[PDB]
C-alpha cells in the first residue's frame, strides 16, 4: 500500500539513535571535564556497543542502523564519527568543516560547541520526525 514513510521513520529513528549514543558519550565527557574525538583516534561506529556485545543473533546485522552504516559512501569496513558526519546517503544532509579532537581547553571552551553543532543537524531530524509523525498520525 503506502508503508515507505514508516521505513523512512525507521531510518530517522536509527539516525537519531546513533546521534543519541554519540551525545551520551558527549554529555558524560563534558561532565567529566574531558575532551572528545571524532577521528581515527576515537571509536568506530560500526560496533555492537551501539546496543550490546558480539553478534546478539543476526538482529543487529539486520538493523536499519547496521544497514545504513554499512551502506555509506564513507564506509570502508570501518567508519569514524568524522566519516559518519561527512558521510552519505542519509536523510539529514552532510556536515562540513569537521576537525579531529575537541579539547576541554578552559575559556572559549569548545567541546559544548561541537555538541551544539551535532544538535544543529539533530534539529532537522526533530523537524522531519514532527512532520512525518504528524502525517503518519493522519494515517
Amino acid at each position, epitope marked *: 500500500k503506502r508503508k515507505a514513510l514508516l521505513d523512512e521513520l525507521k531510518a530517522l529513528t536509527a539516525e537519531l539513535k546513533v546521534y543519541s549514543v554519540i551525545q551520551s558519550q558527549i554529555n558524560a565527557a*563534558l561532565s567529566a571535564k574531558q575532551g572528545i574525538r571524532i577521528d581515527a583516534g576515537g571509536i568506530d561506529l560500526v560496533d555492537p556497543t551501539l546496543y550490546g556485545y558480539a553478534v546478539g543473533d543476526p538482529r543487529w546485522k539486520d538493523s536499519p542502523e547496521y544497514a545504513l552504516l554499512s551502506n555509506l559512501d564513507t564506509f570502508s569496513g570501518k567508519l569514524s564519527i568524522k566519516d559518519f558526519l561527512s558521510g552519505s546517503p542519509k536523510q539529514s544532509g552532510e556536515l*562540513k*568543516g569537521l*576537525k579531529d579532537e575537541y579539547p576541554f581547553e*578552559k*575559556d*572559549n*571552551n*569548545p567541546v*559544548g*560547541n561541537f555538541a*551544539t*553543532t551535532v544538535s*544543529d543537524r539533530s*534539529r*532537522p531530524l526533530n523537524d522531519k520526525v514532527n512532520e512525518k509523525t504528524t502525517l503518519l498520525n493522519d494515517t
Partner: antibody
Amino acid sequence: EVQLLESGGGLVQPGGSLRLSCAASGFSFSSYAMSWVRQAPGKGLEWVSAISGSGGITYYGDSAKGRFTISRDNSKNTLYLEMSSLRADDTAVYYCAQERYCDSGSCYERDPVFEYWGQGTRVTVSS
Amino acid sequence: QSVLTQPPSASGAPGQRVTISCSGSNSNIGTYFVYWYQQLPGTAPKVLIYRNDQRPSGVPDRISGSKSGTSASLAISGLRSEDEADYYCASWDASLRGYVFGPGTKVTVLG
C-alpha cells in the same frame, strides 16, 4: 588592526534577490560559528539568524513568510546571507557576529553570550 | 519571569567617574560574567568588556564590570568622547522576558 569586512550591499529590486557577505581579518577565524543581526533608524538591534542558518527558516521569526537564508565558509574565513521576494520593509542595515567567550558551561543552553561584530551596510528596495 | 531593566540615564563632564546599572535574577545573572555594548554616533555597535572586567586590545581598563544577586552593573573612570553613546547591557536575544536586548540608555560626556 584586527577586524571584519563586509561585501555585497547597496540597492535591490522587488521580487528579485541579492547577497550580503562578511569576511574576517587579523585573526584566524578558522571554524567559529556565526550569527546575523539587523539594524534600522532610531533603534538598537535584532536577530536575523542564529549559528548557521538553522535558526534561519525561509519564512522568518519562528514564522512570518519571508525567504531569507545563509551559507558558511570559515575556511575562506567568510560567510554569506541571501535576500529574496522582497517587501519594502526588508530595506534596512545588517551585521554579523562570532562566538567566543564561554567556560565551565555556565549557561547550560547555547552559550555564555557571543563576542565580536562586523561593520555592516545599507540595503534598499530601489523601485 | 521578567527581570532586567535599563534605567541609569547618566551624563558627566570629560574625565569624570559614572556608575551604570541594570536589574535581573538568579536563574540568569549567576550564569554570566560581564559583557556590554557601546555605539558612537554614525557607527555600527562595538565591544566593551570581558574576563569579568578586561577592556579591548585597543582601550585601557577605564571600566569595571560588576554584578550582585538580582542586579548587574558597571562603572567607568576617565570618560572620553568615544564614550559619547547609547549603551546596551544586552544578552543577544528577545526570548520570553520583557527585557533580553532592551532599549539601551543614552549617556553623554558633558563637553
